[PDB]
């Protein structure tokens, strides 16, 4: 627990100590992407406190020392399951949002490559498929996150929606987002246009872009979507995945491509796969290369003690033996300091 | 007291259960009746005489002391090496235990020996388990770890572990199916 709540001042001095997120910042920056279990914890405790950890600190250091003139750099958070990749990414997202970046946050790229009831065919390119439900959901979340810059950003082309309806150069990107959200059939096209506009305008200095993608390994992997002919669909055929792939290139500048691997929710990957190549594959590693991999490891003893103390202060560990040294040692052994396992065990302990 | 068969062998005669009991009662009366050497020399002609094996502590190349043990549960066989000093790390088949045994029950079984002797976080373990399922492997590793740790705990602690059942090889194994019935004990539905 730190009195410091600004995501720009905390450093190694605050390592292993907590960092608060105000309710307004949680409702604005994080309408999506927070872990479901962390969301449940936030609702229960009424507080959103993230432990500051070396991965987040290092990625913040890189982002603060970044040179926007240089091409946008790719950072890839990798680590064993439940080590904290998603929450470190969320910490960096909060830092950038407080620094007034435009946050293009994909909460889980895995959702876009599986379990899709509505898989239409794109009208812009008949060889690609649309995912209207996911596109509209992400557009709503993006509008909520970046409404402030949404009216200040203008488009720089003509975008035809129907054979008659169109959006004109100089119109706010809010018009594009609203069209996508309201007309669910144009959601994927709105997402593509938004990605293109943000990528092009980040180079002009209009703002600084943070492309924060969780489960990035889903783009260049396989998919569990079948055509009407019971034919498998590779990711490139999906309009959303193709546009996000284009976004993931460092050809542009004026921002950073932060991403996090996630075996959880992946397809055709073994449970114990966590390394960058193991999770990305040849295509994914080729696309991301060069990139800076950042290791997210289990809690060190100081972090474990801090998290246990946080739960005890919240009275979450209702078991009478939890505060004891023996109980702490038992928790440490059972979870092997793994954040997710420790949280899950304390959820019922 | 020698058995009726032994007494018969001595007497080159066939006895009965009640005869043997009578003789044993008489001998017990003799024993109770402050039998001295003159009597004990006779009595002893009819008397018949009736802890964990700590492993040696070995040393690795780097001079660190450890103990090696093995344990089998069902079809699972585990070889466990426990080092005298460590930070509680347990590497099973080269994988961290929380990854090899994603099941809380199996992790608890791994914990049970060390937690019992109050040595959590004091020992490093390298285990290799083959055969069986997850639970059989966890039990075999638990037995091997307990046996290895016996070399590093005191004799009283070793006896306490034995009394807690941490050093007994579970003899419960799958019972063979029998012909004419559904399973080991399940019988085919009777048709009156
Ligand atoms: N830095 C952190 N601060 C606070 N809680 C954390 C932190 N990292 C992990 N946790 C806890 O762990 C859970 C979130 O784990 P998280 O999603 O970060 O892991 P992950 O490895 O990214 O997930 P996945 O299993 O999808 O890879 C929550 O219960 C949360 O409280
Ligand atoms: N409907 C519509 N979508 C557009 C338009 N311009 C860009 N897009 C979106 O972005 C994609 C096209 O991106 P573009 O930069 O032209 O590259 P391309 O996909 O290689 O042709 C489309 O599939 C849409 O999702 C436009 O004028 N109308
Ligand atoms: Mg995650």
Q: CA–CA separation, A254 vs A205, rounded Å? A: 7
Q: Check if the beta carbon of residue A135 is closer than 8 Å to that of residue A188.
A: yes
In sequence order, which residues have a C-beta less than 8 Å from that of residue A305 and are 6 or more positions away? Answer: A328
Contact at CB, B121 and A336, closer than 8 angstroms: no
Residue A16 Cβ inside 6 Å of ligand 2? The answer reads: no
Ligand 1 atom with minimal separation from the A339 CA: 12
Residue A34 Cβ inside 6 Å of ligand 1? The answer reads: no
Q: In this structure, how many other beta carbons lie within 10 angstroms of the beta carbon of residue B71?
A: 24
Q: CA–CA separation, A248 vs A106, rounded Å? A: 12
- B67 by DSSP, 3-state: which? strand
**E strand intervals along A110-221:** 120-121, 129-130, 159-160, 166-167, 209-214
| Ligand nearest to the backbone CA of A339 | 1
Q: In this structure, how many other beta carbons lie within 10 angstroms of the beta carbon of residue A232?
A: 11
Identify which of A50, A79, A86 to mutate to test ligand 1's pocket (most ligand atoms within 8 A of the CB).
A86
Quote the tokens at residue B66: 């450890």
Q: CA–CA separation, A277 vs A179, rounded Å? A: 39
Q: CA–CA separation, A19 vs A90, rounded Å? A: 12
Q: In this structure, is the dihedral angle defined by the CA atoms of residues A220, A221, A222 and A224, taken in order, positive or negative?
A: negative
Residue A159 Cβ inside 6 Å of ligand 2? The answer reads: yes
**E strand intervals along chain A:** 18-20, 49-51, 73-78, 102-106, 120-121, 129-130, 159-160, 166-167, 209-214, 255-260, 292-295
* Residue B119 per-residue DSSP state: -
Burial class (CB in 10 A: 0-12, 13-18, 19+), A80: buried
Q: CA–CA separation, A212 vs A62, rounded Å? A: 15
Which residues make beta-bridge pairs with B59?
Answer: B65
Residue A160 Cβ inside 6 Å of ligand 2? The answer reads: yes
On chain A, the residues whose CB falls within 8 A of the CB of B107 are 333-334
Q: In this structure, how many other beta carbons lie within 10 angstroms of the beta carbon of residue B74?
A: 17
Q: Closest Cα partner for A247 from A138, A115, A98, A133?
A: A138
Residue of the CA atom closest to atom 28 of ligand 1: A38
Q: In this structure, is the dihedral angle defined by the CA atoms of residues B157, B160, B161 and B167, taken in order, positive or negative?
A: positive
Quote the tokens at residue B181: 């019935």
Which secondary-structure segment (H or E) carries A333?
helix A325-335
CA B76 to chain centre: 16
* Backbone φ and ψ of B124, nearest 5°: -95, 145
Side-chain-side CA neighbours of A296 within 13 Å: the count stands at 30
In sequence order, which residues have a C-beta less than 8 Å from that of residue B57 and are 6 or more positions away? Answer: B65, B66, B67, B84, B151, B152
Contact at CB, A333 and B95, closer than 8 angstroms: no
Q: CA–CA separation, A217 vs A234, rounded Å? A: 13
- A75 by DSSP, 3-state: which? strand
Residue A125 Cβ inside 6 Å of ligand 2? The answer reads: yes
Q: CA–CA separation, A164 vs A159, rounded Å? A: 11
Question: How many angstroms separate the CA of residue A167 from the nearest CA in chain B?
Answer: 53
Crossing angle of helices A54-64/A85-98, nearest 10°? 40
Q: CA–CA separation, A269 vs A260, rounded Å? A: 16
Ligand 2 atom with minimal separation from the A158 CA: 27
- Listing from the earlier edge strand, what are the strands of the sheet with A102-106? A102-106, A209-214, A255-260, A73-78, A292-295
Residue A132 Cβ inside 6 Å of ligand 2? The answer reads: no
Q: Closest Cα partner for A37 from A271, A344, A345, A346?
A: A344
User: How would you classify the pairing of strands B90-92 and B125-130?
Assistant: parallel
On chain B, the residues whose CB falls within 8 A of the CB of A305 are none
CA A82 / ligand 1 centre spacing (Å): 5
Q: CA–CA separation, A330 vs A308, rounded Å? A: 12
In sequence order, which residues have a C-beta less than 8 Å from that of residue A205 and are 6 or more positions away? Answer: A68, A254
Side-chain-side CA neighbours of A3 within 13 Å: the count stands at 0
Quote the tokens at residue A85: 């990749």
Q: CA–CA separation, B181 vs B91, rounded Å? A: 43
* Backbone φ and ψ of A284, nearest 5°: -65, -45
Which residues make beta-bridge pairs with A120?
Answer: A130
Question: How many angstroms separate the CA of residue A337 from the nearest CA in chain B?
Answer: 10
| Ligand nearest to the backbone CA of A169 | 2
CA A346 to chain centre: 25
Identify which of A14, A17, A38 to mutate to test ligand 1's pocket (most ligand atoms within 8 A of the CB).
A38
Q: CA–CA separation, A212 vs A225, rounded Å? A: 24
Place of tokens 């791994």: B110
Question: How many angstroms separate the CA of residue B152 from the nearest CA in chain A?
Answer: 20
Contact at CB, A333 and B104, closer than 8 angstroms: no
B107 shares contact with chain A (CB less than 8 Å):
yes
Q: What value, to the nearest 5°, has the Cα angle with vertex A69 and ends A63 and A74?
A: 45
Contact at CB, A332 and B120, closer than 8 angstroms: yes
On chain A, the residues whose CB falls within 8 A of the CB of B114 are 333
Residue A35 Cβ inside 6 Å of ligand 1? The answer reads: yes
Q: Check if the beta carbon of residue A338 is closer than 8 Å to that of residue A82.
A: yes
Question: How many angstroms separate the CA of residue A339 from the nearest CA in chain B?
Answer: 12
- A349 by DSSP, 3-state: which? coil
Query: What is the distance in angstroms between the CA of the first residue and the CA of the last residue of chain B?
Result: 52
Ligand 2 atom with minimal separation from the A124 CA: 23
Closest chain B residue to the Cα of A273, Cα to Cα:
B99
User: How would you classify the pairing of strands A129-130 and A159-160?
Assistant: unpaired
Contact at CB, B120 and A80, closer than 8 angstroms: no
Peptide bond into A167 cis (omega under 30): no
B121 shares contact with chain A (CB less than 8 Å):
yes
B104 shares contact with chain A (CB less than 8 Å):
yes
Solved with = cryo-EM
Q: CA–CA separation, B94 vs A108, rounded Å? A: 31
Q: Closest Cα partner for A2 from A78, A62, A43, A57?
A: A57
Which string of DSSP letters, residue by residue, matches A168-180?
A: -TT-BHHHHHHHH
What Rg do the C-alpha atoms of chain B give, in angstroms? Answer: 26
Greatest alpha-carbon span in chain B: 73
User: How would you classify the pairing of strands B125-130 and B76-83?
Assistant: antiparallel
Burial class (CB in 10 A: 0-12, 13-18, 19+), B165: exposed
- What is the stated resolution of the deposited model, in angstroms? 3.0
Ligand 2 atom with minimal separation from the A191 CA: 25
Greatest alpha-carbon span in chain A: 71
Question: How many angstroms separate the CA of residue B60 from the nearest CA in chain A?
Answer: 26
């Amino acid at each position: 627990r730190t009195n410091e709540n600004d995501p720009a001042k905390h450093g190694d001095q605050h390592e292993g100590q907590h960092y608060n997120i105000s309710p307004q910042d949680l409702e604005t920056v994080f309408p999506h992407g927070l872990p479901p279990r962390f969301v449940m914890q936030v609702k229960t405790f009424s507080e959103a406190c993230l432990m500051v950890r070396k991965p987040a600190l290092e990625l913040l250091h890189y982002l603060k020392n970044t040179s926007f003139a240089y091409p946008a750099i790719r950072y890839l958070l990798y680590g064993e399951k439940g080590t904290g990749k998603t929450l470190s990414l969320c910490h960096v997202i909060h830092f950038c949002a407080k620094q007034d970046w435009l946050i293009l946050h994909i909460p889980d790229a895995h959702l876009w490559v599986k379990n899709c009831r509505d898989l239409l065919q794109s009208s812009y390119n008949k060889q690609r498929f649309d995912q209207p439900l996911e596109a509209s959901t992400w557009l709503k979340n993006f509008k909520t996150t970046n409404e402030r810059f949404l009216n200040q950003i203008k488009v720089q082309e003509k975008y035809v929606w129907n054979k008659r309806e169109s959006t004109e150069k100089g119109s706010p990107l809010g018009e594009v987002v609203e069209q996508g959200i309201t007309r669910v059939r144009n959601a994927t096209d709105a997402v593509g246009i938004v990605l293109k506009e943000l990528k092009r305008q980040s180079s002009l200095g209009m703002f600084h872009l943070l492309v924060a993608v969780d489960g990035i390994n889903a783009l260049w992997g396989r998919t569990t979507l079948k055509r009407e002919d019971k034919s498998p669909i590779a990711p490139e055929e999906l309009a959303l995945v193709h546009n996000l792939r284009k976004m993931m290139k460092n050809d542009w500048h004026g921002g950073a491509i932060v991403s996090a691997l996630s075996q959880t929710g992946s397809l055709f990957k073994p449970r114990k796969a966590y390394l960058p190549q193991e999770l990305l594959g040849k295509e994914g590693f080729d696309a991301l290369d060069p990139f800076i991999p950042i290791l997210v490891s289990n809690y060190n003893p100081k972090e474990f003690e801090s998290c246990i103390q946080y739960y005890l202060e919240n009275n979450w560990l209702q078991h009478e033996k939890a505060p004891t040294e023996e109980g702490k040692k038992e928790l440490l052994f059972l979870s092997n300091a793994n954040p997710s396992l420790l949280e899950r065990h304390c959820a019922y302990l | 007291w020698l058995i009726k068969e032994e007494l018969e062998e001595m007497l080159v005669e066939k006895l009965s259960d009640l005869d043997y009991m009578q003789f044993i009662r008489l001998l017990e009366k003799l024993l109770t009746s402050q039998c001295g050497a003159a009597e004990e020399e006779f009595v002893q002609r009819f008397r018949r005489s009736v802890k964990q094996l700590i492993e040696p502590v070995q040393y690795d190349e780097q001079g660190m002391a450890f103990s090696k043990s093995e344990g089998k549960r069902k079809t699972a066989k585990a070889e466990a090496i426990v080092y005298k000093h460590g930070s509680g790390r347990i590497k099973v088949n080269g994988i961290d235990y929380q990854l090899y045994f994603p099941i809380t029950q199996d992790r608890e079984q791994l914990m049970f020996p060390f937690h019992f002797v109050d040595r959590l976080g004091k020992h490093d373990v390298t285990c290799t388990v083959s055969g069986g399922g997850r639970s059989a492997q966890a039990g075999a590793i638990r037995l091997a770890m307990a046996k290895a740790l016996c070399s590093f705990v005191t004799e009283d602690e070793v006896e306490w572990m034995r009394q807690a059942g941490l050093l007994t090889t579970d003899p419960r194994v799958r019972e063979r199916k029998k012909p004419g019935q559904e399973g080991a004990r399940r019988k085919f539905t009777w048709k009156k």
